[PDB]
């Protein structure tokens, strides 16, 4: 079965039917919704970028804490070297003056004994 459809200046068309159909008949986002979905993805982008930058700023502050900790270790080294050096030097000074004073106290006791010997002589 040939059924012509149309003819025009630059062509023609027809329909060739080789068997009719077995069954008769055929069996059985707004602008705002789009814009809200694009803006939602944008906020998720920005939230992620903000989370990355916050982790990097957390590492900036750890680096500051590391650098400060080294400065505190240095200052405490200085502070404890200085207190121990002064403690040593004072204990040594005291000890040495005490040895010297004992040595002079003994010689002076000999000196008192000499006056007692000289007294004993005139007494007899």
């Amino acid at each position: 079965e040939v059924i012509e459809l149309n003819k025009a200046t630059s062509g023609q068309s027809w329909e060739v039917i080789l068997k009719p159909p077995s069954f008769d008949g055929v069996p059985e986002p707004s602008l705002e919704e789009i814009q809200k979905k694009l803006e939602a993805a944008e906020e998720r982008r920005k939230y992620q970028e903000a989370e990355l930058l916050k982790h990097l700023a957390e590492k900036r502050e750890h680096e500051r804490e590391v650098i400060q900790k080294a400065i505190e270790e240095n200052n405490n080294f200085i502070k404890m070297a200085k207190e121990k050096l002064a403690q040593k030097m004072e204990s040594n000074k005291e000890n040495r003056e005490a040895h010297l004073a004992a040595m002079l106290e003994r010689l002076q006791e000999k000196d008192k004994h000499a006056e007692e010997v000289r007294k004993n002589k005139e007494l007899k």
């Binding site: 970028e49 990355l52 930058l53 990097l56 700023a57 590492k59 900036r60 680096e63 804490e65 590391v66 650098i67 400060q68 900790k69 080294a70 400065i71 270790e73």
Partner: protein, 423 residues
């Protein structure tokens, strides 16, 4: 996305960085005075990726040269192409890092890092469209390792939407310069896991073995090693620098090579190996452990993704034939849950002195071997706390050490996890 800003830090970073600029200046026809004297315009169509155009017909590398010690940069100024670099792009401190990661990363590096970022920021603002950053450094020393990763961190905070790419040289006892390399490398690997997008693992262990075993160089020097590094760095950047049907850039590389963010450590490979060749054999070097610049055997794991670049005049049909035949005969070394995971480019311009070459960028689960080898050296030192006091004295807690090794052993396990994954 056109311009890359290149940074080279520390002794190793500046030595291989210099050789890189030498090699690609030759390829792009740039002499040490910055004048173009080449034969073709393929050499200039993408030259702005790496070079700024000066006034007097000149091309200056977009390169920033960093060190805590002036010695090595004075040596590059005196090197062959020393005069091609912008004089104000040398940024060097005076006191050095002491082979100590904590010095480069905290106290000493912090004092120089804002001088570097000002030069970085001046190079970035004169870019029409900034693709990202490319850093060369070692992980075993003090400046490249500690200050390089501090630099990466600060650049990420200021350019969080740009790609960060490193060429990172791994230490090996076979060619060491300091006894604390295992500490320095493990503290750096932890930083790269978190803060880089793509890292090419350049393994001194493997460079040494290539020189000693295939090249018959019974005593390799850094010159021999750096000739392999420069050949590799020229190969992997081919598609960035020369016009081809692949409009390759640093973000597209990451998108297609990195299935999971932490797994961004690539095994580079090169054929043929040379000291100072048919298409089918070139394609097979992809599984030749002797051709890997990371001391890992690709047949010990599985390729997640692979990029291959062929250079020289050769049949693009014969290349695609042999690539597919390598992929099929070796099917058990590619993961089956990433279909079509090998992509090939061919570029007609061969490297200097070679007629045909191949370069592979592989994301293989066998890279866990490199990291396991560092982990074992770290653990042997750290369990006795050998040399620890030079790091605690810089203010570091011991906990930073255990956290960095835990993270590295986690990376190892994650690579293992995807090596055993089935479809």
């Amino acid at each position: 996305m056109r311009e890359i800003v290149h940074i080279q830090a520390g002794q190793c970073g500046n030595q291989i960085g210099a050789k890189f600029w030498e090699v690609i200046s030759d390829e792009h026809g740039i002499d040490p005075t910055g004048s173009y004297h080449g034969d073709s315009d393929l050499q200039l169509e993408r030259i702005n990726v790496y070079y700024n155009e000066a006034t007097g017909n000149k091309y200056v590398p977009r390169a920033i040269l960093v060190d805590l010690e002036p010695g090595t940069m004075d040596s590059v100024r005196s090197g062959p192409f020393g005069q091609i670099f912008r004089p104000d792009n040398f940024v060097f401190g005076q006191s050095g890092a002491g082979n100590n990661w904590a010095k480069g990363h905290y106290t000493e590096g912090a004092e120089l890092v804002d001088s570097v970022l000002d030069v970085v920021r001046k190079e970035s603002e004169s870019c029409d469209c900034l693709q990202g950053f490319q850093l060369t450094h070692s992980l075993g020393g003090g400046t490249g390792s500690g200050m390089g990763t501090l630099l990466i961190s600060k650049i990420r905070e200021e350019y969080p939407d740009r790609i960060m790419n490193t060429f990172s040289v791994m230490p090996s006892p076979k060619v060491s310069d300091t006894v604390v390399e295992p500490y320095n490398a493990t503290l750096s690997v932890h930083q790269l896991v978190e803060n880089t997008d793509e890292t090419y693992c350049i393994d001194n262990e493997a460079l040494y073995d290539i020189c000693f075993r295939t090249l018959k160089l019974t005593t390799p020097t850094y010159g021999d090693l750096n000739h392999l590094v420069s050949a590799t760095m020229s190969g992997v950047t081919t598609c960035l620098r020369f016009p081809g049907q692949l409009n390759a850039d640093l973000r597209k590389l990451a998108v297609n090579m990195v299935p999971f963010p932490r797994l961004h450590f690539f095994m580079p490979g090169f054929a043929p190996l040379t000291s100072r060749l048919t298409v089918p054999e070139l394609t097979q070097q992809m599984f030749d452990s002797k051709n890997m610049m990371a001391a890992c055997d690709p047949r010990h794991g599985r390729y997640l993704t692979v990029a291959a670049i062929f250079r020289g005049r050769m049949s693009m049909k014969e290349v695609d034939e042999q690539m597919l035949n390598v992929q099929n005969k070796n099917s058990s070394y590619f993961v089956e849950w990433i279909p079509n995971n090998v992509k090939t480019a061919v570029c007609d311009i061969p490297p200097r002195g070679l007629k045909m070459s191949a370069t592979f960028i592989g994301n293989s689960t066998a890279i866990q071997e490199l990291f396991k080898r560092i982990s074992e050296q770290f653990t042997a030192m750290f369990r006795r706390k050998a040399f620890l006091h030079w790091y605690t004295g810089e203010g570091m807690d011991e906990m930073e050490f255990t956290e960095a090794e835990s993270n590295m052993n986690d990376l190892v396990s994650e690579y293992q996890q995807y090596q055993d994954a089935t479809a």
